[PDB]
Ligand SMILES: Nc1ncnc2c1ncn2[C@@H]1O[C@H](COP(=O)(O)OP(=O)(O)OP(=O)(O)O)[C@@H](O)[C@H]1O
């Protein structure tokens with residue numbers, strides 16, 4: 187029944203630190219970097235929409251259209267952006283729409299290698315005449331092999 | 341220093357209240373549980389549930405805040421390049437208005453706290469709220485939180501069914517299995533109604549070491565109280581244990597009440613009647629002790 | 643003088659009745675409960691519930707109105723300086739037409755009361771349905787589901803951050819059917835007060851005592867105040883009741899003041915010591931006297947507008963069944979001390 191020591195103690199200073207601002211959307215690494223089998227920007231938009239559980243059109247209309255500063259982008263976010271889907275071949279192209287989509291996706295995702303997914307590197311050497319399809323072309327064997335092996339489909 | 345700054349006396353009373361309200365004493369139980377939780381988080385040993393107990397007033401929420409801040413600052417060097425990497429997500433369970441816990445609301449609040457866009461526009465790609473469930477699963481996989489804190493986890497048991505009490509947790513079990521996200525369910529002793537178990541034990545009077553720890557935290561509380569004259573409090577340790585049962589959390593808010601009353605009267609010290617004015621009710625402590633005794637008996641199995 | 647103004651005698655009876663009905667007397671119980679409630683509201687210290695118990699007619703609603711007015715006047719310079727701020731918000735719980743309490747109605751009426759008496763300060767609650775209108779009145783669709791309303795209420799309360807949320811006649815929270823528990827109906831309010839950090843003060847009669855101590859958490863994050871009536875065994879409250887009767891008598895707008903102190907046994911018998919009930923009784927007798935253009939108050943006048951014995955007996959039964967349960971003694975402390983081994 188002796189006397190103990192009345193220690194004191196210390197505080198914890200519960201203050202959360204400051205972190206860099208997070209990307210609005212996710213940051214999936216593009217498939218095919220450094221490989222002749224690189225993924226397209228439109229495919230990247232579709233994949234990032236699938237990861238978010240929303241349809242790609244909804245994602246573009248409600249999150250990509252407002253960020254752009256063009257009249258037909260803001261006015262097209264309340265009507266159905268059929269302009270960007272009927273002319274989606276230029277999203278992976280060497281033009282201004284491709285550059286603007288790359289920049290807005292970079293701002294949304296905080297990535298630095300999105301311009302490789304397009305042909306902006308070949309803007310001054312390649313012409314847009316007969317270069318891009320109007321229709322989607324896919325290899326069904328590629329989809330089946332990617333899904334069976336457990337890899338992501340792109 | 342170990343004492344409160346002497347320059348706050350000339351400062352307004354609101355500044356003294358703000359200073360004392362933010363002081364979080366590191367009693368041995370708090371730091372011991374913090375070390376155990378950090379060890380479990382660093383190496384999970386394949387577990388996916390970090391159930392933590394403790395009667396109201398032990399300090400679970402502040403422990404959660406401390407762990408959140410520590411994990412955020414630990415990850416801080418590596419979020420400069422890696423984005424969409426929120427370190428830790430901490431949410432609070434909703435008490436259902438109906439008889440059964442709502443899982444759609446849980447999913448939507450978990451999505452909101454993750455800043456996930458377009459929650460109203462979710463889609464199900466082939467159960468309660470399959471679209472929201474898949475969205476939360478994907479958000480946990482990609483954002484990759486270290487831990488997923490769920491405070492007030494005792495509200496998960498609001499099902500009123502013995503054959504459904506354990507099955508109510510299947511949603512969280514499957515969400516933790518397929519996303520690999522540690523779920524640390526902080527709750528009171530009701531959570532024992534059902535995996536790593538941690539006990540946030542109070543300072544029971546039977547063990548003299550707990551009495552010594554309670555007197556230590558009481559003294560370090562009295563040292564940081566911003567008054568002109570330091571109020572003697574260790575003498576009525578018996579009183580401070582009767583209305584507190586040994587919880588360092590409700591002791592803090594009791595002292596906050598008394599200090600605010602003293603500051604509003606431009607007083608200089610604390611007497612017994614000041615503590616009696618803002619003390620817990622006689623019946624309140626009895627109910628609290630009954631609940632904590634039930635929890636301790638439930639956890640007493642060896 | 644401390645009595646009623648003399649020119650009121652020449653004024654019409656309506657002015658005298660209005661003056662008496664607008665007159666609020668200060669008595670020790672009301673002052674003590676007001677001070678305790680104010681000091682608890684000014685600093686909650688993690689408390690999520692204030693339980694202001696009291697009988698029927700002790701002055702639980704006038705106390706709430708006085709506290710609300712004082713808080714609003716205290717914060718008025720701050721309201722002028724900073725917008726999007728409400729000092730105090732207060733609603734009354736509704737007895738349900740069905741057998742269970744309606745939480746959706748509680749949420750929608752709390753949202754209406756919180757937001758409607760505000761200028762069009764554009765705020766976006768995180769729910770699709772609820773929004774403001776051209777006239778400024780808030781609107782909630784019948785399609786809106788109750789947890790969404792609860793989320794909107796949390797966001798609104800966080801933005802406005804009132805000092806206290808008053809819920810008068812909170813004893814109606816206990817109107818639960820089937821096999822529900824009165825615990826399960828307090829965590830919902832507890833959770834709402836916890837995530838928002840809003841001090842929810844519940845005022846009710848002695849039938850609110852079923853919410854007193856349900857769980858350790860609900861009993862730790864809650865404080866209680868007793869609006870005790872005036873008893874008869876103690877000389878002190880008898881003298882205080884006599885003083886209140888004298889104060890009422892001096893402020894009765896009549897030609898010749900009646901001697902109400904002599905009939906103190908009769909006044910206490912039909913009022914049980916509650917000051918409010920005595921106020922309504924005296925107001926009834928005064929209006930009858932003014933309707934007869936009388937100059938005095940007789941015993942028959944009080945007996946005409948008195949309360950029947952059965953009503954007072956039910957009153958007194960419930961009052962004992964509440965005070966005996968709310969009573970604390972040295973045994974309730976000694977057994978608690980012996981439970982911990984502290985004795
Ligand atoms: N060790 C501590 N030092 C200082 N303040 C504390 C401490 N523990 C808790 N608090 C204070 O208590 C409040 C939070 O509640 P507390 O942590 O006491 O309860 P809890 O039992 O962990 O939570 P709950 O009952 O909701 O499950 C805050 O005001 C916080 O500052």
Ligand SMILES: Nc1ncnc2c1ncn2[C@@H]1O[C@H](COP(=O)(O)OP(=O)(O)OP(=O)(O)O)[C@@H](O)[C@H]1O
Pocket residue numbers: 665666667668669672696697698699700701702703704705847917918919921922
């Ligand atoms: N201290 C007081 N001075 C003057 N009038 C009072 C006082 N307290 C109450 N009254 C009056 O008594 C009447 C009823 O009192 P009040 O509504 O405040 O009761 P309550 O205790 O809240 O009861 P209830 O459960 O019926 O709401 C009102 O006319 C009110 O103005």
Ligand SMILES: [Mg+2]
Pocket residue numbers: 400401491492
């Ligand atoms: Mg807590």
Ligand SMILES: [Mg+2]
Pocket residue numbers: 702703810811
């Ligand atoms: Mg009332």
Ligand SMILES: [Zn+2]
Pocket residue numbers: 325326327328
């Ligand atoms: Zn192929």
